[PDB]
Every structure is written in C-alpha cells, then in structure tokens.
Amino acid sequence: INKLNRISRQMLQEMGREPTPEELAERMLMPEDKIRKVLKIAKEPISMETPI
Amino acid sequence: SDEADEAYSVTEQLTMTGINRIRQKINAHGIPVYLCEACGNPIPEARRKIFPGVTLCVECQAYQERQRKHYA
Amino acid sequence: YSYTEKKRIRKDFGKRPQVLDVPYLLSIQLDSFQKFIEQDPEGQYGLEAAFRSVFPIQSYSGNSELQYVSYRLGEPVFDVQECQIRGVTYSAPLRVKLRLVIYEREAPEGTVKDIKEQEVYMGEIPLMTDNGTFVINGTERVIVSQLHRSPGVFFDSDKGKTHSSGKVLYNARIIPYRGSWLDFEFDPKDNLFVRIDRRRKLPATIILRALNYTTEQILDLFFEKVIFEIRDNKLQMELVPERLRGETASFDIEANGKVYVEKGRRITARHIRQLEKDDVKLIEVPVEYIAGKVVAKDYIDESTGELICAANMELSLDLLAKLSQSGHKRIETLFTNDLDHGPYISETLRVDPTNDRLSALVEIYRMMRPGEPPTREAAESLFENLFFSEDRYDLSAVGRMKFNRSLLREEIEGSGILSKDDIIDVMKKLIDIRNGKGEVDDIDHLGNRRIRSVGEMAENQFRVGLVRVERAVKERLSLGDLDTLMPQDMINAKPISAAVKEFFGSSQLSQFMDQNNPLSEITHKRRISALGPGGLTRERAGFEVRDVHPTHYGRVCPIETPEGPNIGLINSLSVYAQTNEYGFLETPYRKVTDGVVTDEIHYLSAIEEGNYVIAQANSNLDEEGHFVEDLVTCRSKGESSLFSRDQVDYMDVSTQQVVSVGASLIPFLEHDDANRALMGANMQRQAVPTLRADKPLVGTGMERAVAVDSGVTAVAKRGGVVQYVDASRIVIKVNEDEMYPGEAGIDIYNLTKYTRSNQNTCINQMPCVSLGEPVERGDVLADGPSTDLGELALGQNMRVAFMPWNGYNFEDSILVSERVVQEDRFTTIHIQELACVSRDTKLGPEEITADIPNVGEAALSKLDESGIVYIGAEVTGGDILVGKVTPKGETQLTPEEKLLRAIFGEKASDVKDSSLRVPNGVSGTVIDVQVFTRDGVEKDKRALEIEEMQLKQAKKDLSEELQILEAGLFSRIRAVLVAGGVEAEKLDKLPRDRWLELGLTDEEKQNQLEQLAEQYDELKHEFEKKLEAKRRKITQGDDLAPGVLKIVKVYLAVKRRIQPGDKMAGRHGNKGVISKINPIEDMPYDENGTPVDIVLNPLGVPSRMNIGQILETHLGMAAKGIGDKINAMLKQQQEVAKLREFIQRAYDLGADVRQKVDLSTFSDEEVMRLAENLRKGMPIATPVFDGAKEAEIKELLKLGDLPTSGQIRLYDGRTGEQFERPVTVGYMYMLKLNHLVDDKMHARSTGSYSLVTQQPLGGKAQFGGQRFGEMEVWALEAYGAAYTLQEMLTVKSDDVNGRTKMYKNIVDGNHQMEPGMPESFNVLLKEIRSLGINIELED
Ligand SMILES: [Zn+2]
C-alpha cells in the first residue's frame, strides 16, 4: 500500500493528470489485479454514524 | 391556514399594540398645571393648548426624553 | 424594431420613460469569476494577486528565492457535455512558471548565480460555463454569493438585555481583516472598559496610558475645560452661556450687577440669549459649586515641591484652600453634565489601577498570556505588534474605507495598522454615542455587509492551499539540497487542488442549480445568501439579519425570500444592483442638479446613499427634468419625506429597481399584500415547463430580458439570414458587413434536444425562426424550455371564473375542466435516469445477460439479446430495463420444498436475479441508453453497437458542419470571383475546389482569395484533428468506482398529465390543489357558449389581500377580447385595412404611454404575421409599480365588446340556469408548480427493514413506513386506543416475530396478534447491560 501511495503521488505530478491503475500495473511490477485488490483492501471503514 | 394568513395576524397585532402605546403616551385628560413640575417655569398657553394636561415645559420634557433614550 | 419583436409586439402600458436599460442579469457571477481567473498585470485580484501574496518565497536567509514569473490556464480535457456524461468536474489545468534562483553564501547581497526555470502544475480550477454555472461532478452547481460582515469599526448598543434596570451599554468593536480584535464596552456604572481579543475586560484608559499618554493630556483630549478663578472673593468662574443650556443654577446668575436668573432655576434658552446678547464673560457663584468638581491636571507646591492636588482630583474646600496658599488662580476643572457631556473617562480614570505606561503594558501582558514573567521592552514589543504591525494586524483597504468613513474622516484610504489617532477617534465616537450625538449601527445595514462572490471565495481557498504549499516549499528550501532540485520536485499539487476542490465540491455556497425553469436558474444565480463558512448561522442569527432595513432599497429584493426556515437570510438581489469596487452593493441613481434630472446615472453604495436626498422614481417631470411639483417625495436618511424642489440630490433609475427579477414578472405587484408577492415569487420559481409553452397575456415586459439573459434561449451571435433551419440546428449565413475579413464562416448553432435538468424536467430548445427569415444580432433563434419567442412562458393563461361551484374548491382547491387535460396544456415531460451497475461480489462477477431465471419469455419481449432494453420501447412499472443476475452460492434449501423440487425435476438456479426494473408507477418511453464499461472488461454487443452509433454520428456531425462551413467559404470566394475575375456563370460549372487557384488580379481581392483558400485548408486540417480526437474520446476506457464492472443508464421519458392532486398557482401567491377534473358539459358557461376553464374560489381574495389576481383577470379578459376581435377579422378575412385599423386603435389606447407603435411602417404581410400572432390574445405589459390603472382596463375591456365591469353572467353547465349575481371571468396565468402528486403519493404494506434497528426502511424512494412520531402516540393515548397504539409500536414497526406472525394471521383470515417485544427495547436492555448495569425483567 505504501508503495502504491508514493507512486500514485509521483505519477499525479509527472504523468500530467493522474495515475490509472492500468498505468500503475506497469509503473510497478505487479499483475494489475493485485493493484485493484490492494486498492480495495487498503481503504478504511466508513463510520455508520457519519451523518448525511 | 397558511404562512401569509397567520403572518397577517402577527403583523396586525404588532401594528395595533404599537399604535396603542404611542397613543397612550398622548395626554387626553384635562388639568392645567401652569408650572413645569421639575423647573417651575410657566408652561406657555399654546404648549398647553396642543396637549391639554401637559405637566412639563418643553425644555424639561426634552431633557427627560433625552434621558429616556438611553434607558437610564 | 427587432425582427423578433415585430412578430408579437407586446402592448406596453407604463408611463415612466426608461432611463437605464436592464443590466445583464447574470453579471455578478460571470464578472466576479472572470475577474478571479484572468491575466491581469497587477495585484488587483484573481490568481496572480494570490501568487504575489506568497511569491517570491525565500529560504530562511538561504540565498535562494523561488520567484513567480506567470501562470496560464490549461485546456480543459473535457467540454461540458462530455463532462456531464462522464461525471467529471469540468475544469482547466493551471500551469505556473516558477523559477529557482540561488546565491552562494558569499556576496554581494546574494549574488544570483545558479538559477533555473520550469513550468509547474498546481491543481485544476473549475470553470464557470457561459451561463455562470459549474459542472463539478457532472452535476450543475452554482456558487451563491455570500453576505458577510466587512472589516472595520462597529458601534452597537446591546439594548436593555443584560442589566436589570434596562440601561444600554453601547460597545464599540474594531474587527480587522487579519489580526486582533479590539472591543470597547461600557459597564452598568458607565465605565469604559477596553477588552483586547475576547478575553478579560480591562479599564479603558490603560490602553491610552500604554499609548504613552498620561492623565492630564488624557483629560484634555476627552473633555472641555472650565476655568475657575480666585477673584479675590470665593472663587468666581469663567462663563460662556451656551455651555449652561440645561443647567439648574445653584446660585443667582447675575452680571452687570444684574440678576439674570434667580437661583434654583433650570437654565433656559431665554437666559441663554440674555447672557450672550448681554455677553456675560465671567460669573460669580458660591464655593460649593466648585466644591464637587474635579481638577484637570497636576498641581504641586512652590513651597516644598509637594502636590497641591493630583491630576483628576475631586474637589473640596481644603483643595482650594491650598490653592490659595499656592497663589493659584487657574482652577482647571472639567465641564461634566449629566445630559450631554457626561463624565465617563474621568471615572474610568478613578478605576484605572495603573498609573504610567509601564504599568499599563504590565497589565496588558498579564492579560494577554498570563504566567510567564513580564519584561519592560518585552511587553512593549507585544503591545506595539498587537495593532501596529504591517506583518500581523491589518484592516485591509475595505477595512480602512469602512474605518475612515465610520468616523467621518476626509481621507478614504490609509494604513493597514492602527494609530493613536484611530483608537482615540474610536473612543471619542463611542462616548459621544453614549452622550446622545450619534447612533449605534444597525447590523443588517447593507453598508456594513460586503459580498464575496464565486471568484472572491475561490481565491481565498486558493490562498489557503498556497499557504500550506509555501510553508512546505520554504521548509524544503531551507534544506540545503542543491541547485539540482527543479521547482516541480519540491512543490506539491495535492494541497492546493484539494482545498479549492472541496470548496467547489462541498460547501453551503455550492448548490445544485435549481433548474426546473429559466427563472429558477436566473434567480438562483443572482442570490445573496447570508450563511456558509465565513457567515453567520441560523441559530446565532437570528433576527439581526432576518429583516429588511431602509437601505435594502435597490440592492436586495424586499419581498423575494424563501418563506419557511431561513427567511431573510437568502435575500435575492434586485434588478439594477451592482457590486462596488470593494464588495459593497450599489444601485444607480440619476444625477439631479439644481432642478433638472440629468440622464447621467451615478452608482451610489449603501454607506453613501444615507447622506443624500434621493428622489422618488414616480416623480413627474416636465419634458426637461424639472419636477412639476414644488415639494417632491424623497428619502433623505432612512425616513422618507417631502423635500422642496431645490434639494433633491438624486433620482431613481426606474421603478422596478426595488424588486428582484423574480418579483418583477408579476403584474400588479403594487396591488398585493407583501407576503402574498413573496409567496408568489417563490412559487413562480418552481413552475414546471409545459408541452406547449404559451406566453403571458398579462406580463411585465421583464419576460423578454429574463429569458434572453438566461441561458436557455439560443440567441443569435451575429446578424444575417437563416440559411437552413431544422428541428436540431440553425444555420446562419452571416451578413458581409458583420463578417470577419478572412475566415468567412457562418454561424451554426446546434440545439440541445430532450435532456434532463437537475430536477428531472425536460430541457429542450426549439427553433422559432423560419428558413429565409432575417435575423439581427441579439435576436432569439430558439426558445428553450418555458419560453415563447424570447418570452418567459412558465404557465398557461386559462379562462377562469371566480365563484365557489359546489365545494369542489373548498379551502384553496381548484376545479379544473377537462379541456385543460385534453388540450395538454399542462402535460409536462419528465426525463428520469435509471442506473444498473454490475458489481464484483465476493462470489464473482455479475452478468447483464438477457437470460434471467424465474421469468417467462413474455416479460422479455423488450430486452434485446445483450440484456439492455431497446431504445424506443414503451415500458411501464415492473418491466425489466436491464437484465442482471448475481450468483447465489449456495441455497441450502428446505424440507418439503425439496420434495416439490424432486416432484417436478427442476433445479434451483445457481444465480438469482437483480435486474433493473422500472420503479412502480412510472410509465414512459426509453429514449436513451448509455453503457459505461470498465477498462479491463470487454464490451458486450450493445456497448459496441452504441460505439458504432456514436462514431458514425460524430463523423456525420463533424462532416455536416465542415460542409456548411465549406459552402459558406465557397460562396464568399465565388462572390469575390464575380467582380475582378469575371466568369459570371462561366464559373458555376468548373470544379469549385478549383477556386483556391483561379484567376484574378493581384489586388486586395487576390490577398482576400489567398486568405480564404488558407481558411479552406485550415478548416480541413482542423476538423480532421477534431474528428480524430473525438473518435479517440468515444472509444476510450471509462473510469469507474472501484469494484464496478459496468454501468447501464436508461432515460425514461415519463409524460405527466394534470390530475387531481397537483399544485397550481397564479403569480399572486394563490396556490391550490386541483381537486377534480370535471367534464366539459359540467363547467359554467357564458351566454355565448364557451365554458370557463378553471374555477377558483372567491373567498381566498379578500382574506389574502392579493387583488393582483382580480385585476390581472380583468386585464386578461380584456386582452383576450382584443385577440378575439383580431381573430374574427383575420378569420373572416377582411383585408389589411380594417385589420391594421383595429390593431392601431388597440395599440394606442391609454394615458401618456411610452409605447407608441404605428403600423404605418409595416409591410402588409408584416402586419399579417403580427395580427396572426395576436389572434390567440394580444399580450399586455405592466411594469411593476407602473401598471395599467383601472381606467385603462375599462378602456381596453370596452375596445372589445366585453362588459366594462369585468363581470359576465355565466350559466350553470349542469342545470343550465343562470347564476345570479354576475361572476368574474377572465384569463389568468396558471403555473403548474412541480409538487406533482405522483411524487407525493406513496404507500407501504411491507418491505425492507433497517439492519440494526429492525424498522421499516424502504430506501427506494420510498417504501418507508410513516414516521409515526411521538405526538401521534399522544393522540392515541388521549383516546383509549391502546390496541391501535400497541400494534402501531410493536407488530407494525419493530417486533421481528410479531410482524411475520401478523402477516401470516392476516393471510390466514385471523386478525389476532402476538405482541412480543419491540426490538428497540431489547436492544436498549443489551446496551444498558453493556455498561456495568444489570437490568433484568423480573416476573
Ligand atoms: Zn422644565
């Protein structure tokens, strides 16, 4: 996850607009579903008492 | 009813009990006094003619109202 | 006359001649933003004034300065249509060309030796579209201006609400834009107390002493002098007689030896004149008149250097005793009177603990941050930085203006730091407000409240982001890395963009653009909210701002506000109101010199208007600008009045300048209760566009401007001829004179077809021009939603009769006839978007195939093979718009169900279906379907079909447009090859593409031909590259939420029809729910046979004092009578002669109108198009407080052969017997507020249930059970309804076994109930037991 955050901040300010995970699949040596997995796994839970 | 239909009555009570206290400060009685109850000056005939029953000269009334204006 | 106005020219009443045309109604939004984002070479405002504020950023003396050079706004990735389609924020990249220069640490003063340069990327900034709205996540948003209190000095009273006696206290705050506050509060015992930032109060004069003032000059500042003399006999005094005006003499006022007033007398104006006309220059009184005064200054011995008496000393007999021994002759006491010049600073001196400057700074520091040891120059430093630093504290330029104006300073601008001058002027103004010469400030006073707008709020958030980015860059620069770091490896684009994007994307001043209407958008843009970050809330205010002030005139609408929770906080801007150069609102006024009202206008702000005698808009003028009265109604300072001829300083620009755009479309606004017009504007702002937008038969002429200045109309961009019109695009061969020299071109507008606004109304433009028809600049080419030829048609004028008619309009209801529902003049289209996403369950993907378990083939004649419904199929509730199934693994089924499976050999499917079906009740036509697909997935058949369609349509559009531009260019070049190059029609056969290389002189004609040929080649190259980009955009992966495979969006087009339960409304605040749509026969019908269309209740007329509806009814009947006469003449066709005669008569018809139109300059076919537009009924304008008085309405009702009294005799439609007491029947403009019933009506028998509290949820908008609250529980408790309440609280809502038992009992014909226990209660038990508490149910 830490690798992901660092490389994402870097591509955001080097590749113009933002990092697409298809692009992180190359910028890292990972299999591009590992990346989607690790991105959907690192997020924290929403508090069920957060008021809309 | 509605918003405007009760708002009318709120405004109407506001206006009526705002007219009435300003109209109750008006003197309607008759008792000529001839001597300003604070300074003893003689209240002139005309200033007693407008408001019958006025018991202060114009100077002392201006003073007392200036004092009232700060709630003292 | 404009070509779009000779189509249907609106008979305009209203007598005042307009002096200043209506502004551009959207001007605040567009103005403030494009002032925010603009290359403006100075620190006026915007981005660069936010870059200079932090650039250059130096190291900590590090000999390395990162300096700004310039910036630029990138090109937007997506244009606004694609930005809505994809759900993106339409914005522009922001490049910045910083520059790192370095000096090596030797000399001289940082030798610039090793510098760099770059272009950095700091964040994207959203962009305001051409109508002043943003696209933030595909949704239209609007940044409502805020109304916040400006920096400066304020004086308030706190009137009689803290002390018991009721005495007011009169504090005087000083709030700077940045720094420390300063407050000056009296006390109940009349003590000036200065409290620096909101902590503990201090005595007043301690701050003066800290200013290096001591007591003697303090008293000289804050007082007048009185000089007693020991005149050899008991201390006789200096006297000027006007000082005594209000005295009660403790002695015999005598001069000349002559007694002026006997003792005891309250000193009179009489004796005033006696004194000065006789000029008493020194009086003699007893000694106990000086016995109780106070001495001005120091007094010390010539004997032993001992104090005679200290400065600010109460007097006595021994004090004058020692003064005599000192030989003193000048007793300096003060002139303190209870009435005017009261002693306040004197007693505040008495209470002052300290005595000199060091003591004052000691006390101040002990208050500021206690605990630490103080120190002489340490406290000096703290104080003299508190309000005297260019660095820390600053009343900005607006703050300085408000300051130097709120004290009556001749100057208007100065320092950003305070002064002894400033704080002493503040204290003086405060004590003189206490004395009674002056007044406290009204808080709502619009001279005390600025206006941030979208730009002035975006730039502040940009400044927050830039502050954090500069602190990061500074800490990084201090790290002596190298001269190798380039200023993009150092500066992060996360903080800036994050702060500005959370401003625009989520904050109380960024709202959904209400769009159900043209007027709704245009009045939500011009809105002045008083909430949000930086502005007061609802609780804290509170009726300070909840009300109108006599300086709202011409700045903020007095009537147009949302009634309900926040009244008077969301005040909406008036018509002509502008914003000052500072942020203050200003309005125009005609400059009226000595007696003549010049037509030069003059924008006065709020702070200044209260120093002039402003005229009255309805003040007559004698053809030169001289008021034809002697006295004239004006408003000098708040209170209006009569002022003589030669006193008026300004006049009003036009009579609609007090009301907003919303409340200026009401005719006869001056005949309505105020709150009725408020409700009327608010309910006009919700009108739903209709099928056929009509027009107001009674309007105020503001319709045209409100509709043009809104976005929805497709107004022309340049004069010319309509070359090819069509239901989707208008092509305009521009004139040659309004043509650009090279790059001929022709303006081709594409029109937005059926698309959904934010409120699910259908926004769709329609061409109002015809092929071959001329157009001029600023004309109207296409009516948007709710516009008729560049007029705002929000409703439909129907024939209404005011009479009760059988209780069917009992309270407020409205009896609509069946013609209203057959004619489809309220049938309104709503475009709804239904989504269906395929997620990634843990059990696997979700498909969208057209094969779904447990549904017969009959329910799938709509879905195609790919699973998604055909475009154009007419669906209704329960049908499947998308066929999606999710894997169910595994079932683990029941007993006997297993036997039933074995018996019939079926297999429970591995999947269950979650397919997108139309929500129940809806019934409409699927009019569009888009398929967003994740990039990893592969498109199904339908997605690739729609890509085929999109690419072919993009090609066709680009090529149609390039062909139209080709044709224009070719025809222009041909018209050049007509003269000079003569092949008259020896040129119309050879290859047209062989015209870029054909014959001519080498004249300017030849230069033009070369330029035009280059235009041709540029068109080719440009449209080629545009098609390539467009194709790559169409066939390029869509970005999606994490976990979503694909998304299928369907757009039903429901078509609502008016039905009992909808809300309608006149413009005069007369709402009402349609209660019955009775047949035609049953409606009241006049003697001629035509029935009224809508029967309204008369009883709602006098209660609610809106006579505007009755007068609009009369004038509407009059106008439709004129229309009837015109139509019978134009149907029984007479000729242009009689027709022109009748229109000419009906067009003059008034008092001194401003609307002289004459059908002497018309064609005779240009009168026939007109008088056909006037056959449905001839419109009538009626400016707001300048309407058509009843004399003119009688005149117009007499023009047609209607009855003058405005009343007809209707006959009953059911019994045919005439209603006695003749009724009012006219034409009223009925809106249709989109409180439609079928978004109101819902039910629920059983459904979902919440997850923790097992209560009814719905959530599908909305299966929610009713919110059976607490007050209903008491309604049931007042009854003996104990079983109804018990089942209403246990089995209907919570008890998870009682509810299933109840359903089973009901379906089994037994209405018993097993009460069980509410789940809320046993959850409560579990939680009480989860503390250290044991709570059981004993038996
Ligand atoms: Zn008196």
Side-chain angles (χ1 to χ4, degrees), chain B residues 36 39 41 57 60:
Chain B
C36 174
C39 66
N41 293 309
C57 67
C60 255

PDB file of all heavy atoms in Angstrom, chain B residues 36 39 41 57 60, ligand 1:
ATOM      1  N   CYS B  36     -44.029  73.857  35.283  1.00  0.00           N
ATOM      2  CA  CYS B  36     -43.304  72.640  34.938  1.00  0.00           C
ATOM      3  C   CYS B  36     -42.847  71.955  36.211  1.00  0.00           C
ATOM      4  O   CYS B  36     -42.086  72.530  36.995  1.00  0.00           O
ATOM      5  CB  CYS B  36     -42.114  72.959  34.042  1.00  0.00           C
ATOM      6  SG  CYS B  36     -41.064  71.543  33.723  1.00  0.00           S
ATOM      7  N   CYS B  39     -38.964  72.277  36.943  1.00  0.00           N
ATOM      8  CA  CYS B  39     -38.275  73.558  36.977  1.00  0.00           C
ATOM      9  C   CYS B  39     -39.174  74.726  37.352  1.00  0.00           C
ATOM     10  O   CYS B  39     -38.680  75.848  37.495  1.00  0.00           O
ATOM     11  CB  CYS B  39     -37.635  73.844  35.620  1.00  0.00           C
ATOM     12  SG  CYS B  39     -38.814  74.088  34.290  1.00  0.00           S
ATOM     13  N   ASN B  41     -40.969  76.540  35.649  1.00  0.00           N
ATOM     14  CA  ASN B  41     -41.220  77.501  34.597  1.00  0.00           C
ATOM     15  C   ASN B  41     -42.701  77.483  34.248  1.00  0.00           C
ATOM     16  O   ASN B  41     -43.383  76.476  34.437  1.00  0.00           O
ATOM     17  CB  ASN B  41     -40.375  77.185  33.367  1.00  0.00           C
ATOM     18  CG  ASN B  41     -38.892  77.377  33.608  1.00  0.00           C
ATOM     19  OD1 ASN B  41     -38.459  78.419  34.098  1.00  0.00           O
ATOM     20  ND2 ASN B  41     -38.102  76.367  33.258  1.00  0.00           N
ATOM     21  N   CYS B  57     -42.767  71.834  30.992  1.00  0.00           N
ATOM     22  CA  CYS B  57     -42.414  72.730  29.910  1.00  0.00           C
ATOM     23  C   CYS B  57     -41.670  71.955  28.831  1.00  0.00           C
ATOM     24  O   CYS B  57     -41.281  70.802  29.021  1.00  0.00           O
ATOM     25  CB  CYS B  57     -41.568  73.891  30.429  1.00  0.00           C
ATOM     26  SG  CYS B  57     -39.932  73.423  31.015  1.00  0.00           S
ATOM     27  N   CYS B  60     -37.888  70.977  29.840  1.00  0.00           N
ATOM     28  CA  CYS B  60     -37.746  69.853  30.753  1.00  0.00           C
ATOM     29  C   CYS B  60     -38.211  68.561  30.115  1.00  0.00           C
ATOM     30  O   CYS B  60     -37.674  67.492  30.418  1.00  0.00           O
ATOM     31  CB  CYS B  60     -38.513  70.113  32.045  1.00  0.00           C
ATOM     32  SG  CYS B  60     -37.470  70.532  33.459  1.00  0.00           S
TER      33      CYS B  60
HETATM   34 ZN    ZN D   1     -38.977  72.247  32.804  1.00  0.00          ZN
END
